[PDB]
């Protein structure tokens, strides 16, 4: 267990958006529990509750990251998929993003999204690692209202492998 976010205690901590949308942790909904991490207000398929990761975590290390997902309104099924956002050298306009996992979501039901990751050395000059949430890329002018439902997070957990 080297991070856990359950949102029992109602705090947002350090999670963010990645543009516009709006994160709320919300009570009455969770994944067995009563708090979960609420983004909606999106506008962007990748618009996604995001945190970084990196501080938690020994460079050059594979660790295991899961969390569990569900959506509530709109289409019978969605796809949501789990992302890695990497910067190196403190280089902001070259970020890299890499899907580590992605699975077909039935509305109402949580599902879980997990995989093993790779944590760069310390000698690639990584300085931030953020995982994220979001829902299949499209370009903004191809982008539909089932692209951009709001959906909830919980029980986000990376583990030594
Ligand atoms: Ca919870």
Same mark, same amino acid.
Do not use: C
């Given at each position: 267990?080297?991070?856990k976010?359950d949102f029992e205690?109602?705090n947002?901590?350090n999670?963010?958006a990645?543009?516009?949308?709006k994160l709320?942790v919300?009570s009455?909904?969770?994944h067995?529990?009563?708090?979960?991490?609420k983004?909606?207000?999106?506008s962007?398929?990748?618009?996604?509750?995001?945190?970084?990761?990196?501080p938690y975590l020994?460079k050059?290390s594979?660790?295991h990251?899961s969390?569990?997902?569900?959506?509530? @309104?709109?289409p019978? !099924?969605q796809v *949501?998929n789990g992302s890695?956002?990497?910067?190196f050298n403190?280089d #902001?306009?070259?970020?890299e993003?890499a899907?580590?996992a992605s699975?077909?979501?039935?509305?109402?039901?949580?599902?879980?999204?997990?995989?093993?990751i790779i944590?760069?050395?310390?000698?690639?000059?990584?300085?931030?690692?953020?995982?994220?949430?979001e829902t299949?890329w499209?370009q903004?002018? @191809?982008v539909?209202? !089932?692209?951009? *439902?709001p959906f909830?997070?919980?029980?986000?957990?990376?583990?030594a #492998?």
């Open positions: 267990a080297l991070f976010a205690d109602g947002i901590g999670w963010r990645r543009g516009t949308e709320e919300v009455g909904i969770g067995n529990s009563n708090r979960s991490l983004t909606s207000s999106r962007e398929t990748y618009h996604g509750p995001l945190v970084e990761v990196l020994q050059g594979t660790v990251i969390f569990w997902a569900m959506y509530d @309104e709109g019978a !099924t *949501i890695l956002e990497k910067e403190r #902001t306009a070259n970020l993003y899907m580590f699975t077909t979501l039935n509305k109402g039901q949580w599902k879980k999204i997990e995989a093993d944590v760069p050395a310390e000698s690639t000059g990584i300085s931030g690692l953020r995982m994220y949430a299949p499209k903004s002018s @191809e539909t209202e !089932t692209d951009t *439902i909830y997070v919980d029980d986000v957990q990376i583990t #492998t």
